[PDB]
DNA sequence: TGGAGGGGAGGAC
DNA sequence: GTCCTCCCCTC
């Protein structure tokens, strides 16, 4: 009916269930993406500003350009020799480190391979990389999110989403002193959608009516994605949209505020858009894609099918040749090509497994779970994919890892050395989770990877007991003495030492709330 | 890249 | 039944 809105009551109010919001058309997910991140974290504790070209540096590799530094063409990934060849007051900054024999980290500030002094070298070959500082500030960042929202998904060490559902619905029906204009209140602009609410006379599977002109007054903040000019606000998902589009600005602005930040934000219906359109534009700026302008966006030239979560590795690339999509424009070629639903590229599918011709033990798609592949692409070539955010556990694992050059760990007794290293970076680790949210935080299991000199893989893992935090370190030497001596038992008359890898990682927590 | 963190399949136990 | 090994996803 083209007399009412696309959406439903049923829509609306589901915007006020964290379980859900999300399913819901009318969905209005953030993605946040810190600038920089590493280069910013560098900036901040050596009291550096915005305008300092400072890199972050990991042995001879920048691991993040601030944006000041990108004005001279550096990269991530460049060479420190690379970068200070583009840029003369470069600010180079290298991670923390653990020197082998010690058990604490700590920054060597005006160390590094570009120093000419050899008495302020941070060898490859003693030292182990802590990223403890960028982690600390993520846990910071995280608080901040949860405070201003209820459904936070840390993504990973500088990006969230946030669910902000329940505020866009509460400001729609309850708040009473946003003004759209210097003459009119969102109160009084949505007074007929208010008193049906409040009046509570509706159908759940009845539509929306459609919008009352004088929502047209509310503003998007930041930049609305719109090549083809297309109205701004056209239906409820618009008015939802705008309104966690100032939400978010707040915020990020509170991260910046507080913590000093600048971030990269989308804004959309789905959690795979949302993180397309923070990578849109950078740094410092919030990209709304409306759901009017999903294929304007996703056909833009930058993405292809690749470019969404699960498919930037060997499935994508099956999916490719399974499909027979193109090299450039393969969104909408799935689209076009299975137009009217995802039953039409399920019996495409069904047809390519059912073959004897297919491989299905190395094939990566479940034969089994064709009706899902098909509606995931079918929704994803459409900006229409709705996934839940998860909201994750304090830890799920922890990982201390050294790759290893010439000679350095050259027997059991170097890699013990460097056991003992990671055994103390984890027991911190763990000991500061435990202070910060007042938990118990138990190592449950531990897993030992190694690589040898011809580069084979070595694995254990197995269970690890539990004494307290004051034999944690020792309790975790334990087992990694025990499975690096089985390994190297496993790998006599072959190729092995000196070794080029080796790691320890925790792999399963339990973890005991207090209080 | 190195140095992370997430997640799951399936045979071993 | 759960555990261990190996593999695939991402920043
Ligand atoms: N392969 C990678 C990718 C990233 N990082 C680190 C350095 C980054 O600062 C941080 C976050 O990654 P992003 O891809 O978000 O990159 P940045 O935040 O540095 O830059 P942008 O402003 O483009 O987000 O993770 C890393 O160590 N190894
Ligand atoms: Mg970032
Ligand atoms: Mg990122």
Not at 240 to 253: E, P
Not at 397 to 408: C, I, Q, Y
Request: hydrophobic residues 35%; proline residues 3%.
């Amino acid at each position: 009916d083209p007399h009412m809105s696309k959406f439903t009551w049923k829509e609306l109010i589901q915007l006020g269930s964290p379980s859900k919001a999300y399913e819901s058309s009318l969905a209005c997910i953030a993605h946040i993406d810190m600038n920089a991140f590493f280069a910013q974290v560098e900036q901040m504790r050596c009291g550096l500003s915005k305008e300092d070209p400072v890199v972050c540096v990991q042995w001879n590799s920048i691991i993040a350009v601030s944006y000041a530094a990108r004005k001279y063409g550096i990269s991530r990934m460049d060479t420190i020799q690379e970068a200070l060849k583009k840029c003369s007051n470069l600010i180079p900054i290298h991670t923390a480190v653990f020197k082998k024999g010690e058990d604490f980290w700590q920054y060597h500030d005006g160390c590094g391979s570009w120093v000419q002094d050899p008495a302020k070298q941070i060898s490859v070959e003693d030292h182990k990389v802590s990223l403890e500082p960028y982690r600390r500030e993520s846990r910071k960042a995280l608080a901040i999110f949860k405070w201003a929202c209820d459904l936070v998904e840390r993504a990973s060490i500088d990006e969230v989403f946030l669910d902000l559902g329940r505020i866009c619905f509460n400001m729609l029906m309850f708040d009473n002193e946003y003004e759209l204009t210097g003459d009119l209140k969102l109160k009084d602009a949505l007074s007929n959608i208010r008193e049906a609410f409040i009046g509570g006379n509706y159908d759940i599977n009845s539509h929306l009516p459609l919008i009352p002109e004088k929502i047209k007054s509310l503003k998007f903040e930041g930049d609305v994605f719109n090549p083809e000019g297309r109205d701004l606000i056209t239906d409820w998902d618009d008015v939802i949209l705008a309104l966690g589009s100032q939400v978010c600005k707040g915020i990020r602005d509170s991260i910046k505020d507080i913590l000093g930040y600048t971030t990269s934000c989308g804004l959309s219906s789905t959690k795979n858009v949302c993180k397309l359109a923070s990578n849109y534009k950078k740094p410092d700026a919030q990209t709304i894609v409306k759901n009017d302008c999903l294929l304007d966006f996703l056909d833009c030239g930058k993405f292809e099918i690749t470019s969404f979560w699960t498919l930037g590795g060997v499935l994508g690339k099956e999916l490719i040749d399974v499909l027979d999509l193109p090299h450039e424009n393969s969104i909408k070629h799935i689209r076009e090509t299975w137009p009217d639903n995802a039953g039409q590229l399920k019996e495409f599918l069904d047809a390519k497994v059912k073959q004897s011709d297919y491989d299905r033990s190395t094939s990566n798609i479940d034969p089994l779970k064709t009706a899902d592949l098909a509606e995931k692409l079918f929704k994803l070539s459409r900006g229409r994919y709705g996934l839940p955010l998860s909201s994750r556990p304090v830890v799920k694992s922890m990982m201390s890892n050294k790759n290893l050059r010439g000679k350095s760990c050259n027997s059991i007794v170097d890699c013990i050395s460097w056991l003992e290293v990671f055994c103390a970076e984890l027991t911190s680790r763990i000991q500061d989770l435990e202070q910060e949210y007042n938990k118990i935080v138990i190592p449950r299991t531990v897993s030992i990877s190694l690589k040898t000199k011809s580069y084979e893989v070595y694995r254990k893992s197995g269970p690890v007991a539990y004494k307290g935090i004051n034999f944690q370190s020792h309790e975790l030497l334990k087992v990694g003495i025990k499975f690096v001596t089985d390994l190297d038992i496993k790998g006599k008359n072959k190729s092995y030492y000196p070794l080029t890898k080796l790691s320890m990682t925790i792999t399963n927590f339990d973890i005991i709330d207090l209080q």
